[PDB]
Amino acid sequence: GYECQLRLRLSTGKDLKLVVRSTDTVFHMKRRLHAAEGVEPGSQRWFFSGRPLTDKMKFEELKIPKDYVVQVIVSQPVQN
């Protein structure tokens, strides 16, 4: 788990891949979901293949060079 690149599918069509490395995982990944994307509140619902991901998916998958994309859920485009 040295060079990991996971694609994030937010807003149901917001694909932006973050550069992660085993220590990152959906958690740190999420760290960016709020930083890189902007989803900081409870709008950070991690989901891959239709299932909720954990904070240890990156280093656990290792098969996410680019093809793998974790879909998130955020129903707050601009709050309110």
Side-chain angles (χ1 to χ4, degrees):
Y2 187 95
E3 181 179 270
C4 306
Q5 185 180 30
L6 186 283
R7 307 189 62 91
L8 295 297
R9 186 74 62 174
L10 349 170
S11 300
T12 316
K14 171 53 258 202
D15 61 90
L16 192 46
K17 80 285 99 178
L18 162 73
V19 298
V20 296
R21 177 276 198 164
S22 61
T23 58
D24 270 90
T25 67
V26 153
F27 177 78
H28 294 81
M29 192 70 71
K30 169 203 184 181
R31 190 67 70 182
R32 297 302 182 181
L33 270 53
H34 79 63
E37 322 302 305
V39 181
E40 72 167 270
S43 289
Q44 311 170 272
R45 304 186 179 171
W46 334 285
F47 277 79
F48 180 74
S49 303
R51 299 302 302 167
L53 283 199
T54 72
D55 53 90
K56 286 271 61 173
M57 299 304 78
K58 271 45 256 181
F59 185 53
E60 276 187 74
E61 195 61 90
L62 306 322
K63 318 282 85 192
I64 61 186
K66 56 90 86 301
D67 183 90
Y68 284 53
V69 59
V70 186
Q71 181 267 29
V72 305
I73 328 178
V74 35
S75 300
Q76 294 294 271
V78 297
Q79 299 180 90
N80 300 90

